[PDB]
Design a binder for this molecule. Structure first.
Ligand SMILES: Cc1cc2nc3c(=O)[nH]c(=O)nc-3n(C[C@H](O)[C@H](O)[C@H](O)COP(=O)(O)OP(=O)(O)OC[C@H]3O[C@@H](n4cnc5c(N)ncnc54)[C@H](O)[C@@H]3O)c2cc1C
Ligand code: XAX
Ligand SMILES: O=C(O)c1ccccc1O
Ligand code: FES
Ligand code: FES
Ligand SMILES: [Ca+2]
Lengths: 1225, 67, 30
């Protein structure tokens, strides 16, 4: 009795006779059609990994249209008579690659490759609409596509080369969906069932259903209805049907702005501004106008604009029709509008602006919460004909309450006043009062919000006035890049499922610290396809896990953080496992929680005792000092945001405890080890296989085991293959991130800038287990000097034990934190001495042959050359003048420039991890199979190992292959970590190759003109083995804390970065103008790979220091759980001019073919952006705050728009603009 | 499997015990030489102590054998 | 040291229980 759903995928007709309303396109492509090119990266519309092209006939507008969409949000029930194109649709290595695919692959635009298919599809969709796009159109196409690996530069460079109907009924397990064909049908249906939920683009409903746990048993999709899709030009304005896509609104409005006279288009340009930096193309092409309006979010960017302009809403039910202008009464309460339950929004008339009528819209450049506390507004003024006398004033604000509001009392007080200084003052006083926030208001950011309400109005006030008056050394592309661009590269969840394969969903603590009183699964048991619920008692071996054996596999009697894994559901489909998990009821009895570093310190809650490195005489250094500066600094944590989340498949064999696993991990050995220990079985029973990861970044060094062990237990218990891939929100909550650090410090220095004494106490937030916290803090202390000679020094570190997810390894492993604290006090020294920052830094640098604070000698110390060279190529001195000139001429925008060096120690600080094995076979056709202990996460390790092997064997790369990493080829492998994989596996592969050459030698001698294949066959027929191991052990390592001597590191990697930013002093927003990097990587095995690493690391660093902000409830529960509330760098985030150079003529004697580690050393250079921001704020403060040039102000990381704005203390932040006294001329 | 031991002859001619027996014996000897210094340092220890101590001293616990 | 002892085939118990996996006993992909 359900109709058939009929659509097309890559040209091929799909007939689905039993369409479930709840099935996403992404789910159908991957699990019904076997097309796994399209990926899951977030499931909430932010990341674009799931991008596809959609083609449908606009009956109305009368043409086939092509546009991009997020498959994770597209209900298949919206797709009747639509055509879908995926990455497989356009080309592949088996036939021919599309030019888009070839291009991104060859331009080094793909590292891990997980984002690449989505980007390919965005670009492809662009080219299908505009065969010859501008650079601007290309960049805009990628607004909804995230890449964690590349730093974006090579993708844009690479793509630069392209520039210049009857009612249907569907019945699911839970939902009935009606595709309405006419307005009559819509109104009738809504009358028979008023509770029925409308769905158009599903970009809000999808979120409610998936993340907020709603269920609407009846759904009506009205997308087909012509009246909901009309664009109509009237005498009063342009009307849009409620179902029109934001992209249609954008396009219509842009055409009106280009055509009509400026004075008619003030409102249109407000709308367009709010649509500017709004999601991406995927969302804009499916989100409907009415969807945004009726969602009625407190942080809707459109509702404030519609309210301020009296945008007319035509509203309809059976028999009824009315047209109200949007005013303050339209939103009575949280997520509600003024429609009866029968009523649907039909159209929206956006008005022309009249004579003497002006309009502005603005929005906050940050978002930290799901639907609150992001300031956004519409502002409108109408004067008396030809005058400056206010006749009407509207100021409407989102993100200042639980609904869009209007500053009615403030604006009403202005009627008949003139547009001058007094009015500015009166409006600001009113705004600060009428929109005041209690200091515990939901969303926080109280000061910032208040400040933006006033400063947005100031910008409006000023605007209104104006309106008036051998391949080693070669740049070889990543070996997998082509298959990554084509969607042929296999990641863990792309491996096909066994016919009997099951799915696991974790059950997770919702409390920071509590007793587990009881667990009830009776509701989960009712879910179709439920198999079992697993917990601590189901474990046959041991429940004791984690690197320091201080964790449970499943929570026993207590929980110790939000996201602590209590158990697991196994079911026949992932959706069933998801539903059943949400419905397992846990009974808790709350315990006193400890959340912040400050909490931990107050309560002496630490793992172990203070770590310390100390050299010289401190009370003494401080005695001799001319100046002493103390302070405190915090640096926020970071989420890895690998585009591919954690994932494990576990295959139980049924013999002798044997199990085979495929897992997204940097650490096959611990995975194998942990799984065996969980099962109570010898390690020799467990096999772990890693093909590749879609990113790791340290987050997959240890924490992958939380998923692996659970999936393994499920496999053991059921006897079926089982898999689990985490959702983004689960991944961010459970798996841990970078360690937040607090620092209490004191520096003694001379008038000169020369440092004489330093003491730093570091405190890390470790979370609810040890993991790598102790090693991370050691790395921190080893790097508290950065590149500077400090005669008297004492660094302590303390690990804070807290009821938070356990924090872990992240690219830099504690160094960037310590290095950031170093440059912070260094910047304060320069300002205090009143000397150029680059002179103070240069003067304090180590020289060739100096000892660090841990007594290791610096040999081949290239910081001076990198510095020299960066200074020159970046034109530092010239631009510094340009920056001062700019600041002398600009009042409310300021520039900043900073140059910063880095040194970074190379080796695992645990000596026994610096070991590495390889295994090599040469088969009898002479083809070679290389296996080594390293894993591929996008860094191009396998590419580098093929280049090393080809050079060592003296054969073409085409005869050599690396398939995967596995515990049965190379055992006891270190995690792929600490940037040394090229060094150590490079060496191990080299040795195995030498052995093979020594064995072939007598055959090369008997037959020197023979080919490789001749010699190989001849050694085979002489019964000479063509298989061997290779092994390497880093020499001369062993630092002792108790004697403070011995080498901690094999060598150091160095670099220097100069960055320039422009800040908007009124909003806290900023633009990264230019960054120049000079890095010492020795003699690069692969300059394309290495530059890619410099670029990607730098961009991760700039994320850490300026964009990425994790935020938690006072009670320790993560609020920022997806891309919509956690902002990693996007395409539009990178420096406009982004230059990277590798230092020439600097071979490294320590490592393979004179190369150096590159993975982690350049991440910290990202901080040059931060200190350029601090430089600019300093100029803003000299402008509006005081006249003290040697003022030290604190600025924590990340330097988000909030912190930047609050630091620009002015007549707004102080409220001096109100007439009140305060700080500022 | 072909990715652990390459280029093997078919399991044929009744000689598998003789030949794979020698190859396994030779890989065992290699492992014994490698563990020897650790056995000597701690002669009252168990197998597991020697293996761990070898691993911690960065001695390879993997080898081929051939006959 | 078991060399020279009448040690049963290591896989016999599993062969007796039908737990020993032969080629076609491997589960099929969907
Ligand atoms: C990644 C991403 C980024 C975003 N960024 C922003 C942003 O920066 N600023 C911003 O303001 N918004 C933003 N949004 C929100 C987005 O604009 C809305 O989700 C979208 O416009 C809703 O329209 P829809 O067609 O998808 O509605 P649906 O999800 O299908 O429906 C939404 C609600 O509206 C109801 N509805 C739809 N049409 C009608 C009708 N005509 N009559 C009565 N009720 C109706 C539905 O019943 C439902 O309750 C973002 C969303 C995503 C996914
Ligand atoms: N594209 C890409 N590049 C990447 C990674 C990634 O996941 N993807 N991660 C980093 C990290 S983080 Mo760590 O010490 O486990 S804290 S060390 C490390 C490094 C590990 O890889 P080698 O350089 O030894 O081959 O790769 C870097 N480059
Ligand atoms: O010293 C390091 O950088 C390190 C990195 C990963 C794991 C263990 C370690 O000691
Ligand atoms: S998975 Fe669809 S947007 Fe991220
Ligand atoms: S290559 Fe883009 S996310 Fe890794
Ligand atoms: Ca930890």
């Amino acid at each position: 009795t359900a109709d058939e759903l009929v659509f097309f995928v890559n040209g091929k007709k799909v007939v689905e006779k039993n369409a479930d309303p709840e099935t996403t396109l992404l789910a159908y492509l991957r699990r019904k059609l076997g097309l796994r090119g399209t990926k899951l990266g977030c499931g909430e519309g932010g990341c674009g990994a799931c991008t596809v092209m959609l083609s449908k006939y606009d009956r109305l507008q009368d043409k086939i249209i092509h546009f991009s969409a997020n498959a994770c949000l597209a209900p298949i029930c919206t797709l009747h008579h639509v055509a879908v194109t995926t990455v497989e649709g356009i080309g592949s290595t088996k036939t021919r690659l599309h030019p888009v695919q070839e291009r991104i692959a060859k331009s080094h635009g793909s590292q891990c490759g997980f984002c690449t298919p989505g980007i390919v599809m965005s670009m492809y969709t662009l080219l299908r609409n505009q065969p010859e796009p501008t650079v601007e159109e290309i960049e805009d196409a990628f607004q909804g596509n995230l890449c964690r690996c590349t730093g974006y530069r090579p993708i844009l460079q690479g793509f630069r080369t392209f520039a210049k109907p009857k009612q249907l009924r569907f019945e699911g397990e839970r939902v009935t969906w009606i595709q309405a064909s006419t307005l009559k049908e819509l109104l009738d249906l809504k009358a028979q069932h008023p509770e029925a939920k409308l769905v158009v683009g599903n970009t809000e409903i999808g979120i409610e259903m998936k993340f907020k746990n709603q269920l609407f048993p009846m759904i009506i999709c009205p997308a087909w209805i012509p009246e909901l899709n009309a664009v109509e030009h009237g005498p009063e304005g342009i009307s849009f049907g409620a179902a029109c896509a934001l992209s249609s609104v954008e396009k219509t409005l842009l055409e009106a702005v280009a055509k009509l006279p400026t004075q008619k288009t003030e409102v249109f340009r407000g709308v367009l501004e709010q649509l500017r930096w709004f999601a991406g193309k995927q969302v804009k092409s499916v989100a409907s106008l009415g969807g945004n309006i009726i969602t009625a979010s407190p942080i809707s960017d459109l509702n404030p604009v519609f309210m301020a302009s009296g945008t007319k809403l035509t509203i309809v039910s059976r028999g009824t029709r009315r047209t109200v202008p949007m005013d303050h009464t339209f939103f009575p309460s949280y997520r509600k509008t003024l429609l009866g339950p029968e009523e649907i929004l039909l159209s929206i008339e956006i008005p022309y602006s009249r004579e003497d009528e002006f309009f502005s819209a603005f929005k906050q450049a940050s978002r930290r919460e799901d639907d609150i506390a992001k300031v956004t507004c519409g502002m409108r003024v109408l004067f008396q004909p030809g005058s400056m006398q206010v006749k009407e004033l509207a100021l409407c604000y989102g993100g200042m309450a639980d609904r869009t509001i209007s500053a009615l009392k403030t604006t009403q007080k202005q009627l008949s006043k003139f547009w001058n200084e007094k009015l500015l003052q009166d409006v600001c006083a009113g705004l600060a009062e009428e929109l005041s926030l209690s200091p515990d208001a939901p969303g926080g950011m109280i000061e910032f919000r208040r400040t933006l309400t006033l400063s947005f109005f100031f910008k409006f006030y000023l605007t209104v006035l104006k309106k008036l008056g051998d391949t080693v050394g070669r740049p070889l592309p990543h070996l997998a890049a082509a298959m990554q661009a084509s969607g042929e590269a296999v990641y863990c969840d792309d491996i096909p499922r066994y016919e009997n394969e099951l799915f696991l969903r974790l059950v997770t603590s919702t409390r920071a610290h509590a007793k587990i009183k009881s667990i009830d699964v009776s509701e989960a048991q009712k879910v179709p396809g439920f198999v079992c619920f697993l917990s601590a008692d189901d474990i046959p071996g041991s429940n004791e896990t984690g690197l320091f054996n201080d964790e449970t596999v499943f929570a026993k009697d207590t929980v110790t953080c939000v996201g602590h894994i209590i158990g697991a559901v196994v079911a026949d489909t992932p959706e069933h496992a998801e539903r059943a998990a949400h419905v397992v009821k846990v009974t808790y009895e709350d315990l006193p929680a400890i959340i912040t570093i400050e909490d931990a310190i107050k309560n002496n809650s630490f793992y172990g005792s203070e770590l310390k490195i100390e050299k010289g005489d401190l009370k003494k250094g401080f005695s001799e000092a001319d100046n002493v500066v103390s302070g405190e600094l915090y640096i926020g944590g970071q989420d890895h945001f690998y585009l591919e989340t954690h994932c494990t498949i576990a295959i139980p064999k049924g013999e002798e405890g044997e199990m085979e696993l495929f897992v997204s991990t940097q650490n096959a050995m611990k995975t194998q080890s942990f799984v065996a220990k969980m099962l109570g079985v010898p390690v020799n029973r467990i096999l772990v296989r890693v093909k590749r990861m879609g990113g790791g970044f340290g987050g997959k060094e240890t924490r992958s085991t939380l998923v692996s062990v659970a999936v393994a237990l499920a496999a053991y218990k059921t006897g079926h293959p089982v898999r689990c891939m985490l959702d983004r929100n689960e991944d961010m909550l459970i798996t841990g991130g970078r360690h937040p650090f607090l620092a209490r410090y004191k520096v003694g220095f001379m008038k000169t800038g020369t440092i004489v004494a330093l003491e730093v106490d570091h405190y890390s937030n470790a979370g609810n287990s040890r993991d790598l916290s102790h090693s991370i803090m050691e790395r921190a202390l080893f790097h508290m000097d950065n590149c500077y000679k400090i005669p008297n020094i004492r660094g302590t570190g303390r690990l804070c034990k807290t009821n938070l997810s356990s924090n872990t390894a992240f690219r830099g492993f504690g160094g960037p934190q310590a290095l950031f604290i170093a440059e912070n006090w260094m910047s304060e020294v320069a300002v205090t001495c009143g000397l150029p920052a680059e002179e103070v830094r240069w003067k304090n640098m180590y020289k060739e042959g100096d000892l660090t604070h841990f007594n290791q000698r610096l040999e081949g110390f290239s910081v001076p050359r990198c510095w020299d060279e960066c200074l020159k190529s970046s034109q530092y001195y010239a631009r510094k003048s340009e920056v001062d000139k700019f600041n002398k001429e600009n009042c409310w925008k300021k520039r900043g420039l900073c140059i910063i060096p880095t040194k970074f120690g190379i080796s695992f600080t645990v000596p026994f991890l610096n070991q590495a094995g390889a295994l090599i076979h040469v088969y009898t056709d002479g083809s070679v199979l290389v296996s080594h202990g390293g894993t591929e996460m996008g860094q191009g390790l396998h590419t580098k190992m093929v280049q090393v092997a080809s050079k060592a064997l003296k054969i073409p790369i085409s005869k050599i292959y690396i398939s995967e990493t596995s515990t049965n080829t190379v055992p006891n492998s270190s995690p792929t970590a600490a940037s040394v994989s090229t060094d150590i596996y490079g060496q191990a592969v080299y040795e195995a190759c030498q052995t093979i050459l020594k064995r072939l030698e007598p055959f090369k001698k008997k037959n020197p003109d023979g080919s490789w294949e001749d010699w190989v066959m001849a050694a085979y027929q002489d019964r000479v083995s063509l298989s061997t191991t290779g092994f390497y052990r880093t020499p001369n390592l062993g630092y002792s804390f108790e004697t403070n001597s011995g080498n901690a590191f094999h060598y150091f990697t160095y670099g220097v970065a100069c960055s320039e930013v422009e800040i908007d002093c009124l909003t806290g927003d900023h633009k990264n103008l230019r960054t120049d990097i000079v890095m010492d990587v020795g003699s690069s095995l692969n300059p394309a790979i290495d530059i890619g690493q410099v670029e990607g690391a730098f961009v991760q660093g700039l994320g850490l220091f300026t964009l990425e902000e994790l935020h938690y409830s006072p009670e320790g529960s993560l609020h920022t759980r997806g891309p919509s509330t956690y902002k990693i760098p996007a395409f539009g985030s990178i420096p406009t001019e982004f230059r990277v150079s590798l230092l020439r003529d600097c071979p490294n004697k320590k490592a393979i073919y004179a190369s150096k580690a590159v993975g982690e050393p350049p991440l910290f250079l990202g901080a040059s952006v931060f200190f350029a921001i601090k430089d600019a704020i300093r100029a803003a403060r000299a402008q509006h705050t005081n006249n003290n040039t040697k003022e030290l102000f604190r600025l924590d990381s990340p330097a988000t728009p909030e912190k930047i704005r609050n630091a620009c203390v002015d007549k707004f932040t102080t409220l001096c603009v109100t007439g009140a006294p305060g700080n500022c001329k």
